[PDB]
Each structure stands twice: as structure tokens, then as C-alpha cells.
Scaffold this active site. Structure first.
Site, PDB file in Angstrom:
ATOM      1  CB  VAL A   1      -0.886  -0.078   1.131  1.00 18.62           C
ATOM      2  CG1 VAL A   1      -1.982   0.909   0.833  1.00 18.62           C
ATOM      3  CG2 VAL A   1      -1.321  -1.539   1.160  1.00 18.62           C
TER       4      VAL A   1
ATOM      5  CE  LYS B   1      -5.335   5.692  -7.655  1.00 15.67           C
ATOM      6  NZ  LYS B   1      -4.538   6.744  -8.360  1.00 15.67           N
TER       7      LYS B   1
ATOM      8  CB  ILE C   1     -13.194 -11.040 -27.743  1.00 14.50           C
ATOM      9  CG1 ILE C   1     -13.682 -11.096 -29.195  1.00 14.50           C
ATOM     10  CG2 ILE C   1     -12.592  -9.669 -27.456  1.00 14.50           C
ATOM     11  CD1 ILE C   1     -14.983 -10.335 -29.493  1.00 14.50           C
TER      12      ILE C   1
ATOM     13  CG  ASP D   1     -17.529 -24.721 -18.572  1.00 17.09           C
ATOM     14  OD1 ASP D   1     -17.668 -24.767 -17.373  1.00 17.09           O
ATOM     15  OD2 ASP D   1     -16.363 -24.418 -19.117  1.00 17.09           O
TER      16      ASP D   1
ATOM     17  CG  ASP E   1     -14.638 -29.496 -17.253  1.00 17.34           C
ATOM     18  OD1 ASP E   1     -14.002 -30.297 -17.956  1.00 17.34           O
ATOM     19  OD2 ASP E   1     -14.333 -28.220 -17.069  1.00 17.34           O
TER      20      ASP E   1
HETATM   21 CA   LIG Z   1     -13.841 -13.242 -23.676  1.00 17.96          CA
HETATM   22 CA   LIG Z   2       3.454   0.303   3.092  1.00 17.44          CA
END
Ligand SMILES: [Ca+2]
Ligand SMILES: [Ca+2]
Length: 327
Positions: A57, A64, A98, A182, A184
Site C-alpha cells: 500500500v 484512493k 475475444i 459449461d 466438464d
Molecule cells: Ca472473452
Molecule cells: Ca506500506
DNA sequence: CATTAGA
DNA sequence: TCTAATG
């Protein structure tokens, strides 16, 4: 798990975007270890500075955190969510075949929609073209009710071709799950294990059968051990056809099943968890074997497996019916 | 983390 | 060959 929630989920959003729309492997790697550390912390994060104490961090992400913390949001987070192009990539990706590379590539080209994709089916590959065809069908869930219909048939030809085959429809399904994404299918033969220099045909034979009866409809990819495809349940006495489903079948050395099986059967946790135990139990489990530790640091020597049982017996646990292999 | 396509 | 994509 929850007191740290907002921080994480924001952070991942943070990460995911870097790798995705940008090429930011590192920021992306940066973000994830953070939402990683930040996830583990046992108390509430009341300030960046507080977080910042963490490993991974920094000023970067702490800054943020305060903003996230101060106001219920984050702009950087807001602007992406708004960002057309960026959305675009997250979208296109949904397509079977893709990826971030293609994604963006497509995008710079002008292809931003599902429709874009169509006008230029040329620009796409067999994988992607198929993917294009079954976008809808690929995103659907798969009722177990079907899992069993699917399961059946497959176990059905597997047998006809060669009675000496063994298949196991692993995954969640296996694990009793109401729906799956899916199917398997794992697969092996005596005639194929360890050293026995293949028999690719071992794989091939089935694939052929399957299509041969109409179970297989397309081929995304076909290798001598890993078939990757599309299947479908014979659209009944009309009025009801069945959405095209993703399917994978894989070849395997009989000498390796049970683990293999064990493994793909999960759950992700059940495994990690059993596996952790094998460590104490002086063992090692991995997607293909089970070896016994040597105090020296590590060891080798694959213990012999004929079932999910041996693996249990070895580490001295309770055989877990797959149903309850959830954790 | 290994497998396939592809170019 | 290397590189992208699935799992
Ligand atoms: Ca994809
Ligand atoms: Ca640190």
C-alpha cells in the site's frame, strides 16, 4: 470479508481496468495485492494512512482509499464506468475468443458493438465467429436437469465406441450444483497413461462419435488431449430446441485420473483445504499426483491411485461424497 | 499453468 | 516463433 468490502471491490475495479482497457500489468498487479492485503486486515480502515501502513500500500492507493472513504465514491472510478471505449472493451471481451488484446485492437478499428462484430465477421476467427454465433447461448446457465441429459448421452457414446473408456463429468455439476455454465468431461483409458506414448485417437474417436450422433456441433479447438467445443440436446418433438452449450472433453493417462478427477471436482476451497492437510499428512497433492514428503525439504515418488478413495486413505481423512466437497 | 490457433 | 485466449 465485509468490514473491508468497499475498499476491495473498488481496488479490483481499479485493478481490472488497468490490465483491461490499458496495458498496465503492474498497476494491475499493484492493485490486486493491495485489495489482497487490505482484505486480510482484521479491522476497519478509517483512513488511507491507516491502510498505508500496509504492505503493497502506498501513497498511490491510500490516496484512493481516503477519497473512497470520505465520499461514497471515486471519480477515477466514475469516469471509467462512464468511458465509452473502456466500456467497449469490457463488453467485446464477453465474446468467446475475444480478449484484452483483440478487444482493444477491435475497438481502435471502429468495432464497438455486437453488431459491429457482425458486419465484419471476416475480421474475426473461427473461435470468435462461433463465439459470435452463440453469444446468447454461451452466456446462459445450464440447468442440472439438462446436465443429466447431457451427461447421459455422452456417457452413452463413450461406451459404445469403446466399453473400456471412463468419463466423469466433473465440476460443480458433479458436486450436485443446481446449474452449471459449461459441462466438464474428464476422460481416460487403460491403454493411455504415464509413459504409453499416447493414442491421440483415444481422444479423437469419441469426438467423432459425439458429432456423429449430433451431440457435437462445432469445434472451437481440437487437440490430441484437449478437445474444446459446442454441444446440443436434440431439440425434441418440436416447439422446443436447445440453446447451444460449451463443452470440453480431455484425454488422460489412466495412471492420473482420481486426482485429476478429484481436483477439477473442487470446490476451489475443498481442494486447497484438503491439499493443505496433505502437507501435514506428509504429502503433496497436485492436479496429477500425490507424492510423499521427504523431511529434506521436499520429495517425490508418486503414490499409486485407483480412486478418490486412495487419495483419501493416504492423507487419513473422511471420504467426502462429492456433494459435500463444497469446502 | 498447459493447451491450442495462428500468423 | 511467439503471442493470445480458455480453462
Ligand atoms: Ca472473452
Ligand atoms: Ca506500506
Amino acid at each position: 470479508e465485509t468490514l473491508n468490502g468497499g475498499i476491495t471491490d473498488m481496488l479490483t475495479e481499479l485493478a481490472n481496468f488497468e490490465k483491461n482497457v490499458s496495458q498496465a500489468i503492474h498497476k494491475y498487479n499493484a492493485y490486486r495485492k493491495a485489495a489482497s492485503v487490505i482484505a486480510k486486515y482484521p479491522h476497519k480502515i478509517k483512513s488511507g494512512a491507516e491502510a498505508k501502513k500496509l504492505p503493497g500500500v502506498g501513497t498511490k492507493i491510500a490516496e484512493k482509499i481516503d477519497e473512497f472513504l470520505a465520499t461514497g465514491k471515486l471519480r477515477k472510478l466514475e469516469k471509467i464506468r462512464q468511458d465509452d471505449t473502456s466500456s467497449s472493451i469490457n463488453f467485446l471481451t464477453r465474446v468467446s475468443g475475444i480478449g484484452p488484446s483483440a478487444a482493444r485492437k477491435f475497438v481502435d478499428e471502429g468495432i464497438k458493438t455486437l453488431e459491429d462484430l457482425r458486419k465484419n465477421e471476416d475480421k474475426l476467427n473461427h473461435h470468435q465467429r462461433i463465439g459470435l454465433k452463440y453469444f446468447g447461448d454461451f452466456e446462459k446457465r445450464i440447468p442440472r436437469e439438462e446436465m443429466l441429459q447431457m451427461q447421459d448421452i455422452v456417457l452413452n457414446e463413450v461406451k459404445k465406441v469403446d466399453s473400456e473408456y471412463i468419463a466423469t463429468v466433473c465440476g460443480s455439476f458433479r458436486r450436485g450444483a443446481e446449474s452449471s455454465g459449461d459441462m466438464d468431461v474428464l476422460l481416460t483409458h487403460p491403454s493411455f497413461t504415464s509413459e504409453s506414448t499416447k493414442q491421440p485417437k483415444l481422444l479423437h474417436q469419441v469426438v467423432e462419435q459425439l458429432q456423429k450422433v449430433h451431440f457435437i456441433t462445432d469445434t472451437l479447438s481440437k487437440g490430441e488431449t484437449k478437445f474444446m467445443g459446442v454441444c446440443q440436446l436434440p431439440s425434441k418433438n418440436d416447439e422446443k430446441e436447445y440453446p447451444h452449450r460449451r463443452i470440453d472433453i480431455r484425454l488422460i493417462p489412466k495412471d492420473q485420473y482420481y486426482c485429476g478427477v478429484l481436483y477439477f471436482t473442487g470446490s476451489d476451497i475443498f481442494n486447497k483445504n484438503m491439499r493443505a492437510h496433505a502437507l501435514e499428512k506428509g504429502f503433496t497433492i497436485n492436479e496429477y499426483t500425490i507424492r510423499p514428503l521427504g523431511v529434506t525439504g521436499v520429495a517425490g515418488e508418486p503414490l499409486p491411485v485407483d480412486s478418490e478413495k486412495d487419495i483419501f486413505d493416504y492423507i487419513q481423512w473422511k471420504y467426502r461424497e462429492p456433494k459435500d466437497r463444497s469446502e
